[PDB]
Amino acid sequence: IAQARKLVEQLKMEANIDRIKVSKAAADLMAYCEAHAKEDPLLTPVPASENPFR
Amino acid sequence: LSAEDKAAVERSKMIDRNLREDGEKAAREVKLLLLGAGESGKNTIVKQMKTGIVETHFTFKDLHFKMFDVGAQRSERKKWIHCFEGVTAIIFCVALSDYDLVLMNRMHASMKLFDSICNNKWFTDTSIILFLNKKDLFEEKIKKSPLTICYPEYAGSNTYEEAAAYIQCQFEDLNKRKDTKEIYTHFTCSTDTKNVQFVFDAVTDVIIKNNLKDCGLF
Amino acid sequence: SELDQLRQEAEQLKNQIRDARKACADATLSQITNNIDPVGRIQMRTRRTLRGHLAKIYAMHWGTDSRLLVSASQDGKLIIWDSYTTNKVHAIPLRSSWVMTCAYAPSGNYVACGGLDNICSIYNLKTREGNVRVSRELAGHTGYLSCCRFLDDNQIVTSSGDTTCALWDIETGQQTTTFTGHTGDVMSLSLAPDTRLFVSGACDASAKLWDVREGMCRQTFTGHESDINAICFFPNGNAFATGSDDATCRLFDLRADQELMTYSHDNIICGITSVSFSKSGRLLLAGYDDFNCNVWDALKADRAGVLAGHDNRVSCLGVTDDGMAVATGSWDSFLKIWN
Amino acid sequence: SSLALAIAITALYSAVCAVGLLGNVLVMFGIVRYTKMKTATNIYIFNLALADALATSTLPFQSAKYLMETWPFGELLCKAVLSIDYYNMFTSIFTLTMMSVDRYIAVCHPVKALDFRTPAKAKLINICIWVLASGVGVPIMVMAVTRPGAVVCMLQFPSPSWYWDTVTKICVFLFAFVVPILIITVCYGLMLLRLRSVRLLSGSKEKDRSLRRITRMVLVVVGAFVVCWAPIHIFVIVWTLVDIDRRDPLVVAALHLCIALGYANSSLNPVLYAFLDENFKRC
Amino acid sequence: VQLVESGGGLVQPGGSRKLSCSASGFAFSSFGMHWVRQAPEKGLEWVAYISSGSGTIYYADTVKGRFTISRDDPKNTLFLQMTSLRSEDTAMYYCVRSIYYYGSSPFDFWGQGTTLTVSSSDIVMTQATSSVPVTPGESVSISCRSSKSLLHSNGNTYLYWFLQRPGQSPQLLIYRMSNLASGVPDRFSGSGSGTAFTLTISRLEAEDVGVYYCMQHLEYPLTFGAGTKLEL
Ligand SMILES: N=C(N)NCCCCCCN1CC[C@]23c4c5ccc(O)c4O[C@H]2c2nc4ccccc4cc2C[C@@]3(O)[C@H]1C5
């Protein structure tokens, strides 16, 4: 019986969060994936000397 | 390679040898998964030897057995049943004394569980050892309570043999694709010590079948 | 008769949050990334194969140093591999052979495992004696241990099959916190880079984000149509990715409280067992049950590559901290390191 | 004027030699790149294939002997060829015998079989089989001197030479054909009785899909062994016992046809493995 | 963890003697065991080495063919059979345990040692400093030089730093030129490159008075160095 009240309270608590737009999140993900692309040994080929797995 | 590198390789080879020995010892071991309802009766089948899942290790006729009981796992079976894909046999305990008791008839729930386990995708060729428990209670109970309660389409004699054979056949008929599947049926008697022997015989057949897979003429 | 009123109120709040999410949605990330240069194809091959397991590998975890790793098999063995030289450092027997998860402590002094015994066993690797002895056995979960990750050397977080997560203090062996709210079986667990929040995916097609210190669910994500088997965090800690048995990966965002991308193909009808990102988050590696992994472009939703070469279902895959290699453990009792 | 017979025997020898070499090469490639040698059956098939490969090397030598009836390869290659023939014959026959015994153990004694049928044990007994035939191959290479109005290459037994030759041939017949055929028949018959008792009976599919096929494979293996090794043994026995025109081209052709039957058994064992073993058929 | 030595005593030249080492408190069968001797007034020199499983056995050049080293794992005991004894074998003998894997702690524990007295190339390792006076609360640096560079191609410099207190067995301080030992305070620091290495004590206490030794583990026969004594 009280489970319904608990889930109603949880939904009310989760409904009050402030959400940024999808454009901001998309730009943040793009900025992270473009600001760390050089330091990604799998996205770009790695040199044989620098590769610990030969 | 430096000296400690060679000693590390030596350590790796030593524990590889220990791993191989342990794997051989585990491969010399036969695996049974015990299944059944809560009131169906499993403690009667584990007492004839003399949280989480329970293991019982015993030895019969120079053969080592482990039996796993997963009755305390109140969760989705479909997410840990693939852990039991390689077991040699699955024992299923079904009680005969609860055909007239509803807890939905709990014997029908046993049939549903048997149908789900037998036709599972991970148990395409895993043997069933079906133990039908409480035959004395069945004999004492069938004399007053008919089998129409559990099975409306019985249309047979209300004796022990006819009803028991009907229940056994109703459990065999749930086996789809029974060419590659084999179901062993025994009636559980408390005042005997041959029950594990029955399992032994069934277990032996699987090894023979597996051996026919080893020499390429299965 | 208040149950119907409470159900109507719950439906009203669900409609309210759906309307808020729709109002917060203006343009998809696919439209934004339609103008970014893609990667034509990546080609990663096997540099190292680790042999020694005699049963199905169910979990693996990398060390912080990106050289040591721990693998768990259902033959009762937990092996510490030196991935550089294919050397076995430790072989730990387990009391219970039914292990579905393993973890490596960030300090490297402890390992953890658990499974159908409902117990999280923590083993100490740096002892005065030369052996690895069990440090503790955390008990108090009524379901199987599906996942476990180390907050630190003394704090652990465990996901179980009784629809609950837990945060334990290892020294006392007691549950500091218990996270409830999931309808179904919790199957995965990923820790944030700042290690203050964690997402858990369950069998009710729901992923929930929890605050560890306080102990309540912050937001709930529901886009999948089956049970979520894998979860992992984006490197920036503001997004995460989930794989389920509906053959679809999904990238959700936290601060927008929506789904951002779906990674699905008509040629894939099998589930996803494990997912993992790259160091920059450009690549999403997903292990499937059709015996091979797929590497997706996380911003373009294209299958950039395929990691084939496993004879059974890929149960686990991980990426090193420095992003040098990807380690895959499948049911063919082999681990493969790819570069 | 047996030009057609000479051409036919040469063509048969070339065909069986090519087929045996190709089959043995394919078996080696399969056992290398398809399934690792981790089972006793794979171990036995590997060593049987190796014995067959070593045996399928004297085909041009017997072809030239039949064509020219003159041995130009000296006492050295006489000893080498005869020792190779004896060694590979005994090795292949004993490997087949051990495969039959291993199958009998695997079926009729499974509890002891899961301990006995280790790959290490199989390697041990197979190496013992290889080295026990060395005790037969060594005297053949040690004592075989050419003595040519006929260029003749065969063993020079000490006095009494006839007694020693008769003893050697009786021993090779009683320890290369009779004992292995008895062991194979007994082991396979007991295994088939056990499989009849095993619950592959009943049903409209189980019986005629498994037990009949197993009986067919066992019968074809035993029949191939018998009809491809018995004629040359019986012809040796009747050549030693009953006098006959040893200089007759038809008798020489019958000898070389029996030799062709033996080499056909060597080339046909991998054919049976490829087109009859269900493990190779599936995997 | 105990490594108790037994045997020893006074012998005549040409005789034989078995030295025993009883091991307790640790997994004996997983470790490698070294016999290292010390002359009555000189430094340490390595004598023998047996590996886990008794697979790899190494001896020094001055002892090869005269001494044998064996290991009883169920009895948790280490034996050194000693034949053709001469005047150069009068020494105190030490048993050292060493475990070898990735990130290990070799030469970590040393036995008390037993005294044997009788009746009357390789890497050259040098310690230039000897009998250096020190003051409490002040840093001091101890140098060690090598004939061959200890930096292997895998990034490991195989220099081990040990401390021997007066009337006591040596104890391990540094594993590989940077790494502190368990139970050692954060006052010792290892550094160096190539053939030249330094060990720095930032703050000197009253328990640091003793003899410091540098050993190489790059290749056998595992040469030690001379003594760098500091006592004040
Ligand atoms: N699969 C394989 N593993 N191998 C491939 C087939 C190999 C066939 C040839 C084997 N080979 C062995 C030696 C030999 C021989 C044989 C039987 C009885 C005997 O006692 C005897 O001894 C010899 C001989 N001696 C003779 C002496 C005088 C006249 C004729 C002879 C013919 C043979 C045939 C023989 O060469 C023949 C069979």
Side-chain angles (χ1 to χ4, degrees), chain A residues 1-2 4-5 7-8 10-11 15 17 19-23 25-27 29-37 40-45 47-49 51-54, chain B residues 1-20 23 25-38 40-46 48-49 51-73 75-101 105-124 126-143 145-152 154-161 163-176 178 180-190 192 195-218, chain C residues 1-40 42-170 172-195 197-210 212 215-224 226-256 258-266 268-339, chain D residues 1-2 4-6 8-9 11-18 20 23-24 27-32 34-35 37 39-66 69 71-74 78-111 113-140 143-144 146 148-208 210-245 248-274 276-281 283, chain E residues 1-9 11-60 62-74 76-87 89-128 130 132-134 136-185 187-202 204 206-230 232:
Chain A
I1 311 164
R5 310 174 69 87
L7 70 96
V8 160
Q10 177 76 19
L11 273 171
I17 53 169
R19 326 177 145 85
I20 212 67
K21 218 169 301 311
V22 180
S23 227
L29 289 198
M30 264 197 22
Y32 196 92
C33 297
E34 225 204 325
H36 291 258
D40 202 351
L42 293 158
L43 185 66
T44 82
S49 62
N51 213 158
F53 290 107
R54 296 182 194 93
Chain B
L1 272 202
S2 49
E4 331 203 64
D5 295 317
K6 321 215 201 166
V9 186
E10 213 200 335
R11 157 153 182 130
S12 276
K13 303 188 340 305
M14 286 215 343
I15 66 188
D16 264 286
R17 154 153 59 98
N18 290 121
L19 272 176
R20 287 179 284 227
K25 191 213 199 125
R28 240 173 323 282
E29 227 285 329
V30 75
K31 282 196 210 249
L32 310 162
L33 168 67
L34 191 36
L35 281 162
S40 167
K42 303 182 256 174
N43 307 72
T44 50
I45 214 56
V46 311
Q48 306 210 354
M49 299 329 78
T51 305
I53 88 164
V54 201
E55 276 140 297
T56 302
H57 301 358
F58 58 104
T59 297
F60 191 79
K61 279 215 208 325
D62 312 276
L63 200 55
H64 288 344
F65 297 75
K66 314 193 276 203
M67 202 157 49
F68 317 120
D69 173 331
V70 284
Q73 276 293 299
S75 288
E76 281 178 353
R77 282 179 289 104
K78 79 122 179 191
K79 302 208 126 313
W80 48 262
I81 218 74
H82 43 74
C83 310
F84 295 92
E85 199 205 5
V87 309
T88 302
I90 39 185
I91 304 179
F92 207 93
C93 281
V94 154
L96 292 168
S97 176
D98 37 355
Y99 65 95
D100 56 344
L101 164 153
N105 195 0
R106 90 175 316 275
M107 164 93 114
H108 271 215
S110 288
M111 313 195 46
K112 182 177 179 179
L113 192 31
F114 182 82
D115 189 25
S116 68
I117 272 283
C118 183
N119 311 285
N120 208 283
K121 78 198 228 62
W122 305 106
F123 301 135
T124 55
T126 303
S127 293
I128 293 288
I129 303 165
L130 169 84
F131 281 143
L132 299 111
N133 307 318
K134 323 278 190 43
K135 59 191 275 271
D136 298 323
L137 298 188
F138 193 60
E139 289 144 27
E140 295 293 324
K141 186 181 275 128
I142 210 75
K143 252 132 41 171
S145 184
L147 215 81
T148 315
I149 331 173
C150 187
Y151 300 116
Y154 181 38
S157 301
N158 206 350
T159 64
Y160 166 56
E161 307 264 22
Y166 184 69
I167 284 167
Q168 171 182 336
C169 286
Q170 277 287 1
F171 269 93
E172 311 268 308
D173 207 10
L174 261 42
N175 189 7
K176 302 206 299 283
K178 64 187 92 183
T180 42
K181 202 80 142 292
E182 167 129 50
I183 273 156
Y184 306 86
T185 287
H186 205 223
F187 281 25
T188 279
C189 42
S190 187
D192 212 323
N195 229 337
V196 56
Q197 157 79 74
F198 179 82
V199 167
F200 172 59
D201 298 302
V203 152
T204 299
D205 277 26
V206 188
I207 329 182
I208 281 172
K209 279 185 225 258
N210 284 321
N211 285 357
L212 300 177
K213 295 183 178 68
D214 285 331
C215 311
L217 66 183
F218 51 88
Chain C
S1 86
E2 220 174 1
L3 197 68
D4 301 341
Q5 194 51 66
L6 285 150
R7 193 169 291 116
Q8 282 175 16
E9 188 81 41
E11 277 160 1
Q12 183 202 357
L13 271 292
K14 276 161 182 181
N15 295 298
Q16 271 186 28
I17 66 176
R18 187 170 41 82
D19 217 15
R21 137 174 168 266
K22 224 180 185 178
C24 290
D26 41 314
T28 51
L29 179 42
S30 41
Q31 294 165 6
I32 303 196
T33 50
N34 208 10
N35 276 293
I36 185 185
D37 270 349
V39 176
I42 88 180
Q43 284 293 111
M44 316 171 26
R45 67 196 30 231
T46 303
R47 318 273 155 160
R48 227 64 83 190
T49 289
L50 321 168
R51 340 176 100 91
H53 272 316
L54 305 154
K56 298 180 279 256
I57 295 137
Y58 269 94
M60 56 93 41
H61 205 230
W62 275 103
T64 279
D65 59 329
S66 320
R67 193 193 160 134
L68 279 163
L69 66 96
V70 52
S71 77
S73 175
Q74 271 209 358
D75 39 47
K77 288 286 181 333
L78 193 71
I79 305 186
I80 315 272
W81 311 81
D82 171 38
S83 52
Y84 210 110
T85 78
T86 310
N87 262 320
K88 289 181 193 59
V89 194
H90 289 112
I92 308 133
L94 319 171
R95 289 123 174 273
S96 184
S97 99
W98 315 104
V99 49
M100 327 184 72
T101 168
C102 72
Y104 221 147
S107 66
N109 307 332
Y110 297 107
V111 279
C113 45
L116 286 177
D117 58 337
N118 308 349
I119 292 166
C120 191
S121 279
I122 294 156
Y123 299 77
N124 185 22
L125 306 161
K126 328 269 223 282
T127 65
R128 199 97 146 275
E129 312 92 354
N131 57 278
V132 170
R133 70 171 36 94
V134 53
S135 198
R136 212 146 262 260
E137 308 191 6
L138 318 156
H141 261 318
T142 326
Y144 55 94
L145 252 285
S146 41
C147 209
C148 57
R149 299 266 150 269
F150 269 93
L151 254 295
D152 73 53
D153 257 342
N154 194 49
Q155 259 178 332
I156 212 180
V157 49
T158 53
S159 96
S160 160
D162 54 357
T163 76
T164 49
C165 288
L167 176 83
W168 313 70
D169 173 329
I170 299 172
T172 61
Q174 300 294 320
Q175 276 177 135
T176 317
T177 320
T178 286
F179 304 88
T180 69
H182 264 321
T183 278
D185 201 301
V186 198
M187 302 295 306
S188 300
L189 194 133
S190 195
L191 253 51
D194 48 321
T195 319
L197 277 66
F198 83 96
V199 288
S200 65
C203 288
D204 59 342
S206 169
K208 276 175 186 293
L209 165 75
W210 319 82
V212 164
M216 77 285 177
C217 172
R218 294 186 71 80
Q219 39 210 96
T220 310
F221 303 92
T222 38
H224 282 273
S226 179
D227 44 87
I228 302 186
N229 299 304
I231 209 145
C232 94
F233 249 108
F234 205 76
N236 85 323
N238 302 337
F240 67 104
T242 66
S244 48
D245 285 344
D246 65 339
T248 70
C249 263
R250 263 153 164 121
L251 174 89
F252 305 97
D253 184 89
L254 293 185
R255 57 233 307 270
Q258 300 188 0
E259 73 149 18
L260 256 179
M261 216 88 47
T262 165
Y263 309 113
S264 57
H265 218 85
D266 298 340
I268 313 173
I269 50 168
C270 52
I272 318 173
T273 49
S274 37
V275 302
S276 147
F277 261 114
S278 77
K279 191 150 96 67
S280 52
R282 189 50 129 82
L283 263 41
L284 179 54
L285 296 99
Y288 292 79
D289 322 65
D290 63 348
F291 299 179
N292 72 319
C293 313
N294 289 348
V295 201
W296 307 78
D297 212 1
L299 316 160
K300 311 264 312 171
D302 290 1
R303 190 141 89 261
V306 154
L307 261 52
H310 262 301
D311 288 279
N312 214 311
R313 161 198 294 189
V314 176
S315 37
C316 36
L317 87 162
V319 171
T320 78
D321 255 32
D322 48 4
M324 263 302 166
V326 182
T328 57
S330 91
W331 286 8
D332 70 330
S333 82
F334 294 127
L335 277 92
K336 292 209 158 73
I337 295 158
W338 313 74
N339 217 140
Chain D
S1 178
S2 298
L5 295 306
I9 281 44
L12 186 47
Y13 277 162
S14 78
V16 300
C17 172
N24 298 355
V27 162
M28 296 300 175
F29 172 73
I31 211 70
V32 163
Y34 287 167
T35 306
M37 173 197 313
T39 50
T41 303
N42 277 351
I43 270 176
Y44 280 119
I45 300 203
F46 177 71
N47 286 114
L48 191 132
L50 200 143
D52 278 333
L54 286 209
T56 318
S57 50
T58 77
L59 270 303
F61 296 133
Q62 269 84 5
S63 299
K65 194 260 182 181
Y66 180 77
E69 62 267 12
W71 191 264
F73 313 126
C78 266
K79 286 155 152 181
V81 157
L82 258 65
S83 55
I84 277 294
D85 279 340
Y86 272 82
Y87 189 69
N88 287 135
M89 164 170 108
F90 268 111
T91 306
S92 156
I93 294 185
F94 286 148
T95 313
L96 272 166
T97 293
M98 233 47 63
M99 221 150 87
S100 87
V101 165
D102 171 78
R103 270 154 185 187
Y104 164 77
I105 277 299
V107 167
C108 296
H109 297 273
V111 185
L114 49 88
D115 182 74
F116 167 75
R117 293 172 85 249
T118 317
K121 299 296 291 295
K123 278 173 236 164
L124 173 61
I125 164 168
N126 212 341
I127 280 173
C128 287
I129 282 301
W130 275 102
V131 302
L132 199 276
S134 165
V136 193
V138 158
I140 305 302
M143 80 97 72
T146 66
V151 194
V152 176
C153 163
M154 49 40 62
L155 280 83
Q156 189 179 1
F157 293 102
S159 170
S161 184
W162 61 272
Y163 177 78
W164 280 117
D165 197 4
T166 306
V167 163
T168 304
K169 263 144 180 196
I170 290 299
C171 281
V172 86
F173 179 75
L174 257 58
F175 278 74
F177 183 71
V178 165
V179 165
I181 202 53
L182 268 190
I183 281 167
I184 278 183
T185 45
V186 160
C187 281
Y188 276 161
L190 296 190
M191 162 183 136
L192 253 54
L193 289 200
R194 197 47 188 94
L195 283 193
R196 283 186 153 80
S197 312
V198 165
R199 264 184 200 225
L200 291 193
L201 279 190
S202 278
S204 305
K205 196 254 187 181
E206 292 269 73
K207 174 70 171 67
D208 39 20
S210 295
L211 187 60
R212 183 81 263 174
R213 195 185 191 282
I214 290 158
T215 308
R216 179 170 62 86
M217 158 139 50
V218 156
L219 273 199
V220 86
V221 162
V222 177
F225 188 87
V226 162
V227 312
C228 295
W229 269 113
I232 178 176
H233 276 92
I234 75 85
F235 201 35
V236 159
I237 292 298
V238 302
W239 193 72
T240 48
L241 265 299
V242 185
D243 292 331
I244 211 66
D245 45 353
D248 199 285
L250 196 135
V251 152
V252 175
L255 220 72
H256 275 89
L257 181 63
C258 285
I259 291 278
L261 282 200
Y263 282 126
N265 197 2
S266 268
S267 179
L268 181 162
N269 279 315
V271 162
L272 288 193
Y273 166 55
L276 217 33
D277 201 73
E278 305 183 331
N279 188 291
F280 190 84
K281 178 188 308 305
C283 310
Chain E
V1 182
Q2 285 303 112
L3 285 168
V4 166
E5 280 286 331
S6 66
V11 278
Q12 311 255 67
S16 311
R17 160 86 34 174
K18 164 181 268 214
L19 297 201
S20 267
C21 157
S22 295
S24 100
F26 78 105
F28 176 79
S29 58
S30 72
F31 273 83
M33 299 297 276
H34 299 259
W35 286 97
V36 168
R37 79 152 78 110
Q38 174 161 27
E41 293 303 310
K42 310 267 109 177
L44 309 152
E45 63 248 29
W46 169 79
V47 170
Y49 163 65
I50 191 153
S51 71
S52 302
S54 300
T56 317
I57 293 175
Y58 288 115
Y59 298 102
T62 87
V63 296
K64 176 88 58 45
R66 319 174 17 231
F67 296 158
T68 70
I69 170 177
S70 61
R71 160 200 211 108
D72 203 295
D73 288 325
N76 288 317
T77 295
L78 183 78
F79 306 126
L80 184 68
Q81 202 47 57
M82 258 165 27
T83 45
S84 174
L85 283 186
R86 47 160 165 250
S87 191
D89 285 329
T90 295
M92 170 112 62
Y93 287 90
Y94 297 137
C95 49
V96 197
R97 63 162 218 190
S98 62
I99 189 93
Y100 295 115
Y101 55 90
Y102 181 68
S104 175
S105 211
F107 281 80
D108 40 316
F109 195 83
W110 290 56
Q112 279 305 113
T114 169
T115 280
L116 174 99
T117 188
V118 310
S119 292
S120 290
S121 278
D122 44 352
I123 294 187
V124 199
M125 215 96 188
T126 57
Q127 319 204 0
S130 70
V132 47
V134 282
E138 285 289 324
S139 67
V140 80
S141 301
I142 293 167
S143 158
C144 183
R145 262 220 326 271
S146 167
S147 77
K148 197 199 298 189
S149 177
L150 299 186
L151 183 31
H152 207 90
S153 63
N154 45 32
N156 285 340
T157 321
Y158 289 117
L159 188 81
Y160 288 69
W161 275 111
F162 302 94
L163 156 82
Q164 167 154 77
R165 285 175 191 102
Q168 256 201 337
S169 69
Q171 103 188 24
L172 168 78
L173 294 175
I174 298 289
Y175 326 143
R176 291 166 226 109
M177 180 234 90
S178 314
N179 319 84
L180 251 73
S182 275
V184 173
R187 299 188 269 110
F188 302 87
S189 315
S191 58
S193 178
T195 74
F197 328 100
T198 78
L199 173 73
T200 81
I201 297 116
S202 159
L204 186 120
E207 56 104 16
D208 299 356
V209 164
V211 196
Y212 286 63
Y213 300 92
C214 58
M215 197 210 43
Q216 66 97 25
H217 209 307
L218 175 74
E219 55 184 64
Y220 288 84
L222 260 61
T223 51
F224 280 81
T228 312
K229 193 200 284 306
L230 51 152
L232 196 33

